[PDB]
Design a protein around this ligand. Sequence first.
Ligand SMILES: NC(=O)C1=CN([C@@H]2O[C@H](COP(=O)(O)OP(=O)(O)OC[C@H]3O[C@@H](n4cnc5c(N)ncnc54)[C@H](OP(=O)(O)O)[C@@H]3O)[C@@H](O)[C@H]2O)C=CC1
Ligand SMILES: NC(=O)C1=CN([C@@H]2O[C@H](COP(=O)(O)OP(=O)(O)OC[C@H]3O[C@@H](n4cnc5c(N)ncnc54)[C@H](OP(=O)(O)O)[C@@H]3O)[C@@H](O)[C@H]2O)C=CC1
Ligand SMILES: NC(=O)C1=CN([C@@H]2O[C@H](COP(=O)(O)OP(=O)(O)OC[C@H]3O[C@@H](n4cnc5c(N)ncnc54)[C@H](OP(=O)(O)O)[C@@H]3O)[C@@H](O)[C@H]2O)C=CC1
Ligand code: HEM
Ligand code: HEM
Ligand code: HEM
Ligand SMILES: [Cl-]
Lengths: 514, 513, 514
Amino acid sequence: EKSAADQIVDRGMRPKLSGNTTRHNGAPVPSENISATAGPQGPNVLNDIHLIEKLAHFNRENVPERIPHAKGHGAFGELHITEDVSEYTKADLFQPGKVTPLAVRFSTVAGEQGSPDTWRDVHGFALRFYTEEGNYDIVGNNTPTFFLRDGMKFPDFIHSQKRLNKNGLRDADMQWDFWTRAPESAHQVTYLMGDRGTPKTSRHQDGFGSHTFQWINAEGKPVWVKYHFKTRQGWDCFTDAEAAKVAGENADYQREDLYNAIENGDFPIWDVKVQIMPFEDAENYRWNPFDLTKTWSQKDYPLIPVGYFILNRNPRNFFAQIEQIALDPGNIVPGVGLSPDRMLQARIFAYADQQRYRIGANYRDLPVNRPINEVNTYSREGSMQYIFDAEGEPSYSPNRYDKGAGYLDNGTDSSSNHTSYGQADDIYVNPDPHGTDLVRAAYVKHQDDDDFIQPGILYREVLDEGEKERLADNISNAMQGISEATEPRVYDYWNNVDENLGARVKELYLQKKA
Amino acid sequence: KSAADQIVDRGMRPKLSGNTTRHNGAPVPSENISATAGPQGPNVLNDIHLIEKLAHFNRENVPERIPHAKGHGAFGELHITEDVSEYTKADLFQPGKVTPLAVRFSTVAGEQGSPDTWRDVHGFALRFYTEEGNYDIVGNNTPTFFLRDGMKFPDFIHSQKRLNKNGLRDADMQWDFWTRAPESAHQVTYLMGDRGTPKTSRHQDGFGSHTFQWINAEGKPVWVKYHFKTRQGWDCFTDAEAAKVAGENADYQREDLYNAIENGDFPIWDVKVQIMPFEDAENYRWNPFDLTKTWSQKDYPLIPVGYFILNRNPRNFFAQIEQIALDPGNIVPGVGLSPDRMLQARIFAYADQQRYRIGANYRDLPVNRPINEVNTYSREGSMQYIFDAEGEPSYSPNRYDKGAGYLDNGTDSSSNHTSYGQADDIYVNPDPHGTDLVRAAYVKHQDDDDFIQPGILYREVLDEGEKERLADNISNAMQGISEATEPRVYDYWNNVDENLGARVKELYLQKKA
Amino acid sequence: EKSAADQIVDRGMRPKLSGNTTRHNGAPVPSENISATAGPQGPNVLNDIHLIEKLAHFNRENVPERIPHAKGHGAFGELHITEDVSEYTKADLFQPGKVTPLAVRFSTVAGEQGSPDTWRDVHGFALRFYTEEGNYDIVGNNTPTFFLRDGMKFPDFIHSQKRLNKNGLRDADMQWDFWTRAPESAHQVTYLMGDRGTPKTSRHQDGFGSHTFQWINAEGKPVWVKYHFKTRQGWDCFTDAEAAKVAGENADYQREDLYNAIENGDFPIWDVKVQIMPFEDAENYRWNPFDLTKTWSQKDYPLIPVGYFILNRNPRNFFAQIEQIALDPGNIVPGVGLSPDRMLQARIFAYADQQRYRIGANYRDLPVNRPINEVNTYSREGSMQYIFDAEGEPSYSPNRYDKGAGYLDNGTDSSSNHTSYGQADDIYVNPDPHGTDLVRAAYVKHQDDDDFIQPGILYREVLDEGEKERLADNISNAMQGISEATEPRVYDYWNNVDENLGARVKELYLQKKA
Ligand SMILES: NC(=O)C1=CN([C@@H]2O[C@H](COP(=O)(O)OP(=O)(O)OC[C@H]3O[C@@H](n4cnc5c(N)ncnc54)[C@H](OP(=O)(O)O)[C@@H]3O)[C@@H](O)[C@H]2O)C=CC1
Ligand SMILES: NC(=O)C1=CN([C@@H]2O[C@H](COP(=O)(O)OP(=O)(O)OC[C@H]3O[C@@H](n4cnc5c(N)ncnc54)[C@H](OP(=O)(O)O)[C@@H]3O)[C@@H](O)[C@H]2O)C=CC1
Ligand SMILES: NC(=O)C1=CN([C@@H]2O[C@H](COP(=O)(O)OP(=O)(O)OC[C@H]3O[C@@H](n4cnc5c(N)ncnc54)[C@H](OP(=O)(O)O)[C@@H]3O)[C@@H](O)[C@H]2O)C=CC1
Ligand code: HEM
Ligand code: HEM
Ligand code: HEM
Ligand SMILES: [Cl-]
């Protein structure tokens, strides 16, 4: 417990072993060097049991990588609460003085396993807190916003960032064809194409929940919140050229950086802060507060400190604890809720769904995925069931025994006779839906909602001249390879962000087109 | 000849003779003797055919369905003989249409080897290969069901299957669940009557059970329920007879159907609907969206649509029946859902299990492909047999011509605040009766309770022999329940009807030694 | 202006489609942009069927990558026979005048499927010929030899080339610890550390079967053979530094090169040649002829021309036709046999074993894996069974019908009554086994057999002075990061190859270390 995470990371690990190897049934292995033949020059025999066992398990080492965020790495640590936010949330892990074990995984998005850490890309920033009321995951990114506001479009974006169907090549035309035809992408593409598209390490970047979530206090009062994880190491970014150079020198530069830092006792820290928007502020804010492509201005809603987290433990086994971790924004806990962000709501479905396939039906039972409290469930069976309920316990509720049911239920019947429980605050306390029908509709339109104002503000009001110039230079690099059909779409896109940025992008682009 | 012939021939090899080949096409030396290093020497590793043959044998089994593992089916045709175009624009239901079909029949609780004639609900699952996509009506041989909320479905199904400790099915478990979930009473009464043991798949009705929606060319909705009325007529075993046949032929109904079709005795069902005007819903005496409530045929009589006939046996049972992926979520223009929470859970659940039970690309298998071309941006996944034309885009919106949704413009992401309005293709919704996410009861209609409908069946519909057999069947099914469950069951049946309840207890006590 | 492989490459491809999209049941998709909600600001509904279907299938796009050789790419083409080799083999594809469709996949070995093509590594060179007597695969490498002579050691070598269990980092100490303690590796490590460890493209390298195989003629007479695929484009290699620079600029450099070459009509060609060792020559050759770590001298066995192959077709769909191809040395055909090469014998089991898992039980039925002749098999069922036998055909043999049995069988009974078939020449005509017992034994020891003489010969008699210096430089670079425990073991390993090479390796290593 020299990290509070020691209880978690030690789960499943064998003691150190010596002497001679054994087969998987426990019988001694004769040789790891020579296989059995019928005569020295005779054929290999079928019944070299160790040989076949060794080859067959070797043949099954690989599992499907994540889509997206295949390339990643992580660590374990502790969340420490230093402020009192109890007036906003009853979430157990956020109460005063609470110390909670965590896991984190960082990643890129588009590239596969083995792809370089320092390709220009968004970086994943995904936390698990092992709380007393269950695992609470905040699966964030190193950006406060994102490319889209509807999950229907997510697989379109991700195919466009991956490889063409015909030849397995990533493609500039495809990336820009998608982005310019999905102009809601403007805010995040501006962020991505700036310095922060190439952070040097996982330690030298902020993390964000990106989405608006909900906090609910002990008396059932909700507020809207956004999470901000502010690096104590500070933002530090490569130039476009530097990142590509590092990609060739060390494709695992960030994975290695984090390992070395923790091994050397240089434990990275982030200050945990939130923006808090009162429930009553939501409808009249200048931007739609639930549109992922819109950040809340920190002038309107400043960061409020909560505490900090520290990464102080490397994994014991990378594959077992990091590759197999199943981080999921749907892992919420009491005191935390969702919001009418359609991207978030799609995510709440999508992660567990992929994980049931990528890992297996019983992925929740793996050491790194089990919570610290006992799971009380009627789920059973499935492939590779390691853990099962006490002998003879019932498989169904309501039942005549004592296993139990939901906290809203009485534990003895099916809640018939027209029983109602009321508002599902554990999902979220909803605002006005603005309609009574199943629809495919726009988000409620707020005064300053469009696809371009916020990245325009970033360019005009936040970025210094160097940042503005590198942005244009980066963009024009990224455009190399687009078709002639795509060129004017890209010019238009950037002009819509800012006419000066757009002019400079085109200027540099034509210079390089040679 | 059958309209299903083009479907059912997909994937089938020509008959082959001569000698066998390995899976790479090379000649097999022997199917009888394996290669050894000397006649009495060890088997060699590199008998390639031996290992290939053993390894593929080792991989023949796949997860059976949960539930409805034990089943069997056929192919056929739907024929429209009436004009229902005022109610629906669904292509397959338009005047004169003839549509190829598939069907799978099944029990519910038992596993792959279990008997067809255990007392159980029977599945009645149809696929129509329409010009506008596969439309599946995944029904049962009952117009109702045990529950009104999908949250409870795995509880019911575990209670119908085996105890975790010893792998035995269990009467106490079945009745403990049924009596503590009294919404079950309508279907339990149906299940425990004669129709719990139909002799064959041909001698039972089918039903969609749920309220669905039909929408016409002008966008006007009506609520509908499907009824498939058997031309062979209901014909049921007694409790004792079904149990006897269960041991004599575990595949009684599977064999019966295959034989009937081989002999040219093609079974036929008349396809009819009940149609409830959209404006009738709120004031009907029962909640029209509660699965445990039937619509009275006195209030809404059956309206004829056409008939379907089964005239084709599968070419290969595993390939075409075990691997068929029937799914109530396979709807088509002109058909919609309803605020039935059981139905809404099913719309998710089937494709979810199928992605696992069969594979991510299960839709590409011959029996699961529609007759029209699929135009999708989905790609890759295990065992991808079918892929798009070379170089076609993987994303939309794009600058090419593959296309997008019929609501979309095909060129952009529908930003700038584009709205499409009511999602009628899902269903034209009635009043939700609230503005908040809630866990709530169904809207309460005047005669809604858990017992009135099976009581009416018993008191007003069942004849004297049916009433007595019902009590006899229930008391048989009760044998083995714990003393802690007996009084709960007595009261349950009293709630249905006091005379039924009295008779059930009387017979139960007689049989209890 | 097409290809003989067009029949293969078109299997499974849809026609071009336009209009609007459909769900997977064929019904029209309402939108690819907006998901359905209960009110514009209400929750997403569960029954957006298209949303869930699109996300769920997106979630299942990935499959396990190969272990090893995850990162690869390929093409299709034609094998043309130009010489008469019928005196040596009856194999159909090798008969005079035969033109046979082919597939090829090139690859690296260690890295995962996003990793750079131009990491220093062995490159895979794996061919499939779609012959009239089945698919014949020659799954070779760009080297005539390899690191080991026993499949028992293969998973040890491959872990040592992949990532440490604790942190997911590849590791120089691990690579050299294994190589030096398994000194049979010396031949291939010398090849790997030379110029050929970094070929510029897939087109500018030779290919080899590496193992000794067997050819059998129509009369049943065997000879031992080795396959050589000599590039008409010529060897062309990066330096160690250039290869890393390219890895950062374009991780898919070689994938892109091959695609572009074929797209442009610059079809790469290799001349197909064999070495042929008479059956009577094997026991008295100066080296063991079945030891993968021993090449046959081309002074003793010159190359004999057979024909050439040309790559003239890019895949229609990369994932469907390349990622899912199941290349397998066990795919032999009449006229071709194996040998007492233990590595080869282990491979004959291992590939189909992995493919059953990596792809699925029915992987043989996928378009790219089906032969051009009809498969007549009693195998049945299994996940995703697309193809099934004619209605009512029997599932077992011997049977009273016509489907048949093996060519040695009579088609009517089980071959009891003590029926014997004799020597299994279809596997191979074996030489003497040199013993009568199941053993774990060394290979038969030939006069000049050791772990170091052949790369010593390469260094002393083949390499030019620049090649000799680059070799020492490359080695010393690859040694950076090894522990002090490993240093003297590496110094000694290189001295065993050659005292002068050894001295220069140590010299440069100590220079670079600081
Ligand atoms: N939560 C938010 O509102 C965030 C907004 N932004 C961008 O800043 C604009 C103004 O937001 P508002 O909060 O009103 O303004 P503020 O002035 O209060 O803050 C601007 C934000 O932009 C960040 N920033 C500085 N340089 C870059 C850059 N190179 N690339 C990306 N971000 C950078 C700042 O980080 P720092 O303090 O370290 O300089 C700060 O968090 C928005 O349009 C948005 O695009 C960016 C991050 C968070
Ligand atoms: N969709 C529906 O309205 C159906 C309802 N039921 C049951 O009938 C009751 C009355 O419904 P309503 O339509 O108003 O009355 P109706 O008289 O108009 O129809 C009653 C239905 O009950 C059927 N029935 C007859 N014997 C049995 C039995 N052994 N087990 C199950 N069903 C049987 C009849 O079949 P048949 O005409 O062939 O004799 C008929 O379909 C309901 O409470 C319900 O339990 C049952 C089937 C359909
Ligand atoms: N199958 C074989 O016999 C091969 C053996 N070797 C190596 O060559 C040595 C001598 O064998 P032998 O055939 O008797 O001699 P040969 O002179 O007849 O052939 C030497 C081989 O070495 C190749 N070679 C040239 N440069 C390099 C290099 N930078 N790295 C690796 N290989 C290179 C040659 O290719 P090229 O003609 O184009 O110059 C030629 O194939 C062996 O010890 C073996 O290590 C290498 C390739 C094939
Ligand atoms: C509707 C939009 C999105 C969908 C459908 C989606 C879906 C997914 C899925 C299925 C995975 C793989 C999970 C697994 O297999 O374990 C994943 C990975 C990931 N996603 Fe999302 N995503 C979306 C948008 C976002 C957003 C907005 C963020 C950040 C706020 C985000 C952050 C991440 C991170 C960090 C990972 C990697 C987690 C890890 O390291 O294991 N994604 N996404
Ligand atoms: C919310 C409640 C229900 C859920 C979650 C559910 C779920 C399922 C699932 C996942 C399957 C297996 C599908 C497959 O693997 O191919 C199945 C089988 C089946 N279910 Fe349902 N079911 C529900 C209620 C019903 C109802 C009400 C009916 C009839 C109206 C029904 C009829 C059937 C039939 C006929 C099959 C077998 C289809 C076949 O023959 O392949 N189920 N159920
Ligand atoms: C006993 C030693 C070896 C074993 C057990 C072994 C096993 C394997 C396996 C299981 C695969 C993945 C197959 C798949 O999933 O499709 C593979 C890939 C491959 N191996 Fe081997 N291997 C061995 C040595 C060799 C040798 C000596 C060569 C060359 C002569 C070679 C060439 C290749 C190539 C080219 C691939 C990639 C094929 C492709 O591009 O799809 N391997 N190896
Ligand atoms: Cl799955």
